[PDB]
């Protein structure tokens, strides 16, 4: 009843994390596609050896461990170091590498300049070409962002720590200390279907 | 209508500079289907591009219908690209949209009109034929079909030049004939000018009016299909009849043939008759004339360009002088003949 | 050795009954390459399988090297398999082992020979034409030889019977030309009897002794290849350069062609030639002997099913009696003459 | 410092434990590849309906919350519910469903019925053919096993953060409350190469 709700609400704020980053830091670095090799369009060089490396090194780091390291950092940037407002910041970054590369596979998977044969039509890059890349690009994209969501929510569960807030601390607190075969379970059952819902939510 | 002149383009690897096209001059009238044919990867592979200026040809002036394109004005080039259309090497359809949509895209683009887009797409679908029946079903179509949508989109613009690039390459002969004809019709009546590029001269016999043979960024021969008789690429000038080659399919017969010339055996000759005429009963004549016997292993004729292409693989039995008399006689009588080897 | 009687297999969905093979009886003579060719997707697929019982025939008895298969005794079955070997659709090689490795694979499973493993294998690699040169690489090698690696595996058991399943269809024709001869070569040498199933006729003409034609599960024709002119499925008879000389001739050639004879013109002839000898100086012979002229429209020859087939389409000029005189002259010497029309 | 060496060691011990659980219990549900029932040897009666589904829900389940709930079992199974040595157990289970599917896909990625057609070739009855499968299966299994450990190592960092000790424990205790630039900053770098090493070990 009352114990469950503040928390799930907050767990959903994991999604609010994405509206915030899937946009600004994911796709914008999905600009790796210009830099993948042939300069698909003027915007490449040797940057990719390292830009792809940073993403990979960020990918290398584990969830809470990045979060704590970030806590000092969380403070310096609009942070009290604790709570949801602060917590999402380390989640979008933990998230940046998972999301960015997801974009790269989506962009690479689509059929080569075969579409840039659009330019041959008289396509003009801008929204015209970029905007009509998306079309083919969304079925790939929707699946990509939706999966990050199941992983972002799992990331709050990893939360429940000092640089965190939400449902994970509720599961953490009663769960770590004060085990309830009752409440601890609600948390389990709650999260598992919430996870499945995220996956069905897509399509 | 489409002039390529003094056109040269090369690519830079930093480590090396790689030659592609070296001084090409193309004279393709209007209302004519012009074929360029080349060896694998001879650069035909690049060139259809210079014409709509996808590639940015290092030198020469490319003039399509009166404006000479140069990489310097994207907005201006865009007014022109609408003018010159192009099918593709592969299909190029958005799996996202339906046939109407793919075809629509260009209409949708620069023009932006409410009604016009639907009627054009509809008539065009009707002209390609995938339309009265295929408005709605999207990108999952037969290859000839996919293709149709494609040309249909190329026409969608309402252009003066269509660029054809290996269109029939991924398409089986049955499809390829239905498709090549489809170009032919829009050619006779839409008044459309086509500049073609291909692997196989099968494509060149059906639709080509003028041809260019390209090896190494240079054009070896350029003329109407009918007069093409003149230099080295007799192969593909001989883009045969499978019927000619098949002789040697039973490779037991090919391994029979010894290249080395030796006594007490006879030669296999490839005879190509340059346009003498149908009125050319030369082998029979030699038969009466020099006492030679012609066992013909293979042979074919076709009228490409309204005249008979003709080639032949035979054994010519006789005394040594007599065969010599015969090939000699034939050469006098305009037959390129080369000795394959001796059986 | 291999005999099939009433091989009927039916596929059961549960709710649905589907006919696989219905009553097929097939007699394959040891020491022969037997072809079962048929429509694309017609169940040719089940039949090859029935021979070593991969698939269980609902009705009929299969006899290989004199043994019949009752599915009840598995142990019995395991034994016969060493005798009848198999080849594949796609290469079907194993990544884990190098080329020397796959071939030994079967030797190991029951026989467990400490050293014949080098003997049979090396002899096989030498036999196959692949061994000394590319003995080292496992999975990646040029596509044609990729197959040979499997064949050696098949011959590893040194079995009386070897089976095929469109192996050549996959490989490009040059490789296809090669695989079929290796099959003849292991054939001549080991007295290997083989059963071949294939998508195309050319697979049949290079090495099929007897060929079976299968349509929708029933067996339509069985005969020696030279003979196979039977009940109305010429189409396949047609894929051999019969799709060039016959249905094509030169294509707009016919408007020149008349259904009936008319004033001052020549009779076009289909010259079909018999298991004649190679010298066949017949066409030439006519010009010298009868004063006649041969303009040959089209022709080819091949060794198919053991006897030469020679086909020609040729306009034959001459006096009204002299040309009639020639057709008869040819007829005594075994030349089939047919007149399509006059041009 | 003194701590870092012991923490790295503890994290490796998590891998050591991992080999028993990674394949002794995962593989058995690798039996699911047999359960597909379109032949593929055996597979009578539709076992596949929920053996794969249950594995999936466990996979679905979020790390930290898994271990906390798992404590009732952990406290009973080994003497202290809070030991690192003890934490390897709660750990074994989270890994299992995740790894078990790894078994099915690595096996399915490999080159079809044709190999199976080797049955026609050699006698290859049941045991013999199994013996044809393993050879192919390993490059699949190990490449697969390799990725199982790194995600799995990251999973341990959470245990340090709680149920047990680990390189996570120090990161947590020194970073979670202490915020030592000196140790924590190095904990991430330390982990980053720790995972890379798991990848190289893969070749």
| CATH number, position A64 | 1.10.3720.10
DSSP bridge pairs for C194: C33, C162
Q: Taking Cα atoms as reference points, which of C319, C324, C315 lies closest to residue C295? A: C315
For residue A35, give its domain range: 1-203
SS3 state of residue A134: helix
Quick check: C250 and B303 CB within 8 A?
yes
Indicate if B115 and B205 belong to the same structural domain: yes
Q: In units of Å, what resolution does this entry have?
A: 3.7
Question: For tokens 């709710």, what's the residue?
Answer: C15
* Backbone φ, ψ for residue B310 (5° rounding): -155, 135
Q: What is the CA radius of gyration of chain C?
A: 25
Which two structure tokens, joined as six digits, stand for D70?
A: 């798992």
Number of domain units in chain A? 1
Contact C89, C167 (CB under 8 A): yes
Dihedral sign for Cα atoms in the order B73, B75, B81, B83: negative
As a 3-state breakdown, chain A gives helix, strand, coil percent values, each rounded to 5, of 75, 0, 25
Indicate if C45 and C177 belong to the same structural domain: yes
* Backbone φ, ψ for residue B247 (5° rounding): -60, -40
Question: For tokens 């007014």, what's the residue?
Answer: B79
Q: How was this structure determined?
A: X-ray
Cα–Cα distance for residue pair C292/B223, rounded to 1 Å: 37
Which residues in B lie closer than 8 A to residue A42 (C-beta atoms)? none
Indicate if C243 and C218 belong to the same structural domain: no
Report the gap between the CA of A104 and the closest CA in chain B (Å). Answer: 19
Indicate if C253 and C124 belong to the same structural domain: no
Which two structure tokens, joined as six digits, stand for B1?
A: 């209508």
How many CB atoms neighbour CB A42 within 10 A?
A: 7
Quick check: D121 and C153 CB within 8 A?
yes
| Residues of chain D in Cβ contact (below 8 Å) with chain A | 57, 60-65, 68-69, 71-72, 153-154, 157-158, 161-162, 168, 171-172, 175-177, 179, 181, 184-185, 187-188, 191-192, 195-196
Indicate if B136 and B99 belong to the same structural domain: yes
* Backbone φ, ψ for residue A45 (5° rounding): 180, -140
Quick check: B105 and A120 CB within 8 A?
no
Of D124, D125, D136, the CB nearest to C94: D136
Cα–Cα distance for residue pair C105/C101, rounded to 1 Å: 7
C106 touches D at CB < 8 Å:
yes
C287 touches B at CB < 8 Å:
yes
Dihedral sign for Cα atoms in the order C142, C147, C150, C156: negative
- Exposure string for B307-342, b = 16+ CB within 10 A, e = fewer: bbbbbbbbbbbbeeebbebbbebbeeeebebeebeb
B285 touches C at CB < 8 Å:
yes
Length of chain D counted residue by residue: 203
Cα–Cα distance for residue pair C138/D8, rounded to 1 Å: 40
Please spell the DSSP secondary structure of D113-139, one letter per residue. Answer: HHHHTHHHHS---HHHHHHHHHHHHHH
Cα–Cα distance for residue pair A55/B167, rounded to 1 Å: 41
How many CB atoms neighbour CB A149 within 10 A?
A: 21
Q: Taking Cα atoms as reference points, which of C192, C202, C248 lies closest to residue C225? A: C202
Cα–Cα distance for residue pair B102/B97, rounded to 1 Å: 6
Which two structure tokens, joined as six digits, stand for C167?
A: 């192996």
Residue C277 assigned to a binding site: no
Indicate if B287 and B209 belong to the same structural domain: no
Sheet holding C218-224, edge to edge: C84-86, C161-163, C193-198, C33-38, C210-215, C218-224
How many CB atoms neighbour CB A56 within 10 A?
A: 14
Contact B39, B86 (CB under 8 A): no
Residue B44 assigned to a binding site: yes
Cα–Cα distance for residue pair C51/C48, rounded to 1 Å: 6
Cα–Cα distance for residue pair B149/A183, rounded to 1 Å: 60
**Do at least 3 CB pairs under 8 Å connect A with C?**
no
DSSP bridge pairs for B35: B196, B211
Q: Which residues contact C247 (CB under 8 A, 6 or more apart)?
A: C238
* Angle of CA points C11, C16, C22, to nearest 5°: 40
How many CB atoms neighbour CB A130 within 10 A?
A: 13
SS3 state of residue A82: coil
How many CB atoms neighbour CB D128 within 10 A?
A: 16
Indicate the pairing of strand B210-215 with strand B33-38: parallel
CA distance readout (Å), B209 to B204, B238, D141: 8, 17, 60
Q: Taking Cα atoms as reference points, which of D183, C307, D63, D125 lies closest to residue A192? A: D63
C294 touches B at CB < 8 Å:
yes
Quick check: C302 and B249 CB within 8 A?
yes
Which two structure tokens, joined as six digits, stand for D23?
A: 């394949």
Residue C30 assigned to a binding site: no
Q: Which of C182, C200, C229 is the last residue of a domain?
A: C229
* Backbone φ, ψ for residue B199 (5° rounding): -70, -40
Quick check: A62 and D162 CB within 8 A?
no
Indicate if C106 and C165 belong to the same structural domain: yes
Quick check: B109 and A121 CB within 8 A?
yes
Task: Count how many Cα atoms sit within 13 Å of the Cα of residue C194 in the half-sphere of its side chain.
Answer: 31
C64 touches D at CB < 8 Å:
no
For residue C317, give its domain range: 230-343
Please spell the DSSP secondary structure of B91-144, one letter per residue. Answer: ----TTSBHHHHHHHHIIIII--TTHHHHHHHHHHHHHSTTTTTSS-BS---HH
Indicate if B289 and B222 belong to the same structural domain: no
Cα–Cα distance for residue pair B51/B48, rounded to 1 Å: 6
* Backbone φ, ψ for residue C116 (5° rounding): -70, -15
Cα–Cα distance for residue pair B80/D95, rounded to 1 Å: 61
- Exposure string for B119-150, b = 16+ CB within 10 A, e = fewer: ebbeebbebbebbeebbeebbebeebbbbbbb
Q: Taking Cα atoms as reference points, which of B234, B239, B229, B224 lies closest to residue B34? A: B224
CA distance readout (Å), A9 to A3, A197, B29, B143: 11, 15, 71, 51
B246 touches C at CB < 8 Å:
yes
Of B294, B299, B303, the CB nearest to C298: B299
Q: Would you give the DSSP letter of residue B276? A: -
Indicate if B170 and B85 belong to the same structural domain: yes
Where do runs of H (alpha helix) occur along C263-308? 282-290
Of C177, C241, C292, the CB nearest to B243: C241
Instruction: Tell me which chain D residue has its CA closest to the CA of residue C55.
Output: D120
Sheet holding C67-68, edge to edge: C17-28, C2-12, C59-64, C67-68
Which residues in A lie closer than 8 A to residue B138 (C-beta atoms)? none
Cα–Cα distance for residue pair A26/D86, rounded to 1 Å: 39
How many CB atoms neighbour CB A62 within 10 A?
A: 27
Which two structure tokens, joined as six digits, stand for B242?
A: 């499978």
Cα–Cα distance for residue pair C127/C186, rounded to 1 Å: 7
Cα–Cα distance for residue pair D127/D28, rounded to 1 Å: 17
Question: For tokens 């080994």, what's the residue?
Answer: D78
| CATH number, position B150 | 3.40.50.300
DSSP bridge pairs for D93: none
Q: Would you give the DSSP letter of residue C192? A: -
Where do runs of H (alpha helix) occur along C160-216? 167-170, 173-190, 201-207
Question: For tokens 């190469």, what's the residue?
Answer: D193
User: Following CA atoms B185, B186, B189, B192 in sequence, which dihedral angle do they give, to the nearest 10 degrees?
Assistant: -140
Indicate if B196 and B48 belong to the same structural domain: yes
Where do runs of H (alpha helix) occur along chain B? 44-51, 74-83, 99-106, 116-128, 143-156, 173-185, 201-207, 242-245, 251-256, 282-290, 320-332
How many CB atoms neighbour CB B75 within 10 A?
A: 8
| CATH number, position B343 | 3.30.70.260
* Angle of CA points B76, B79, B83, to nearest 5°: 135
Number of domain units in chain B? 2
Cα–Cα distance for residue pair C312/B301, rounded to 1 Å: 12
CA distance readout (Å), B27 to A118, B46, B53: 27, 18, 17
Indicate if B135 and B266 belong to the same structural domain: no
Q: Which of B183, B201, B229 is the last residue of a domain?
A: B229
With 0-12 / 13-18 / 19 or more C-beta atoms within 10 angstroms meaning exposed / middle / buried, residue B278 is: middle
Contact B2, B193 (CB under 8 A): yes
Question: For tokens 């994207």, what's the residue?
Answer: B74
Q: Which of B179, B210, B229 is the last residue of a domain?
A: B229
Cα–Cα distance for residue pair D96/D55, rounded to 1 Å: 8
Which two structure tokens, joined as six digits, stand for A163?
A: 């640089």
The distance of Cα B282 from the centroid of its chain, to the nearest Å, equals: 31
Question: For tokens 């948390």, what's the residue?
Answer: A187
Contact C63, C30 (CB under 8 A): no
């Amino acid at each position: 009843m009352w114990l469950l709700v503040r928390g799930v609400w907050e767990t959903l704020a994991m999604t609010f994390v994405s509206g915030f980053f899937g946009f600004v830091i994911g796709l914008p670095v999905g600009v790796l596609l210009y830099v993948t090799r042939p300069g698909q369009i003027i915007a490449n060089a040797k940057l990719y050896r390292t830009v792809s490396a940073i993403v990979n090194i960020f990918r290398s780091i584990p969830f809470i461990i990045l979060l704590v390291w970030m806590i000092p950092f969380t403070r310096v940037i609009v942070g009290t170091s604790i709570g949801l407002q602060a917590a999402i910041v380390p989640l979008t970054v933990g998230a940046a590498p998972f999301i960015a590369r997801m974009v790269e596979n989506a962009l690479l998977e689509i059929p080569t300049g075969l579409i840039e044969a659009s330019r041959a039509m008289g396509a003009t890059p801008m929204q015209i070409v970029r905007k009509v890349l998306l079309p083919e690009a969304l079925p790939g994209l929707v699946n990509a962002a939706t999966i990050t969501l199941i992983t972002l929510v799992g990331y709050s569960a990893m939360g429940g720590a000092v640089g965190a807030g939400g449902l994970g601390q509720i599961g953490y607190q009663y769960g770590y200390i004060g085990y309830n075969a009752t409440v601890m379970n609600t948390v389990l059952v709650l999260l598992v279907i919430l996870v499945y819902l995220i996956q069905f939510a897509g399509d | 209508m489409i002039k390529l002149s003094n056109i040269t383009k090369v690519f830079h690897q930093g480590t090396r500079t790689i030659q592609a096209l070296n001084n090409v001059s193309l004279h393709v009238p209007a209302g004519q289907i012009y074929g360029v044919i080349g060896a694998s990867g001879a650069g035909k592979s690049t060139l259809i591009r210079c014409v709509n200026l996808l590639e940015r040809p290092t030198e020469g002036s490319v003039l399509v219908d009166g404006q000479e394109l140069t990489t310097l004005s994207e907005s201006e080039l865009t007014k022109a690209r609408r003018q010159i259309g192009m099918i593709f090497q592969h299909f190029n359809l958005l799996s996202s949209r339906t046939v109407f949509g793919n075809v629509a895209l260009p209409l949708e683009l620069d023009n932006t009109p409410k009604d016009e887009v639907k009627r054009r797409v509809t008539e065009l679908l009707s002209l390609v034929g995938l339309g009265d029946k295929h408005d709605s079903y999207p990108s999952n179509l037969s290859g000839g079909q996919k293709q149709r949508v494609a040309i249909a989109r190329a026409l969608a613009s309402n252009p003066k030049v269509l660029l054809c690039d290996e269109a029939t390459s991924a398409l089986d002969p049955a499809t390829t004939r239905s498709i090549l004809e489809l170009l032919k019709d829009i050619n006779r009546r839409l008044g459309l000018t086509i500049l073609l590029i291909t692997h196989e001269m099968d494509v060149v016999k059906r639709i080509c009016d003028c041809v260019a043979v390209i090896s190494n960024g240079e054009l070896i021969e350029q003329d109407t299909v009918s007069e093409v008789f003149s230099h080295p690429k007799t192969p593909l000038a001989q883009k045969f009849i499978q019927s000619t080659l098949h002789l040697d399919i039973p490779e037991d017969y090919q391994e029979r043939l010894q290249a080395e010339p030796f006594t007490d055996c006879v030669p296999m000759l490839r005879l190509e008759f340059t346009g003498q005429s149908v009125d050319a009963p030369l082998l029979s004549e030699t038969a009466r004339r020099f006492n030679v016997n012609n066992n013909i292993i293979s042979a074919q004729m076709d009228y490409a360009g309204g005249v008979k292409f003709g080639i032949m693989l035979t054994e010519m039995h006789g005394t040594q002088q007599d065969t010599q008399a015969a090939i000699a006689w034939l050469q006098e009588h305009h037959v390129k003949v080369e000795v394959l080897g001796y059986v």
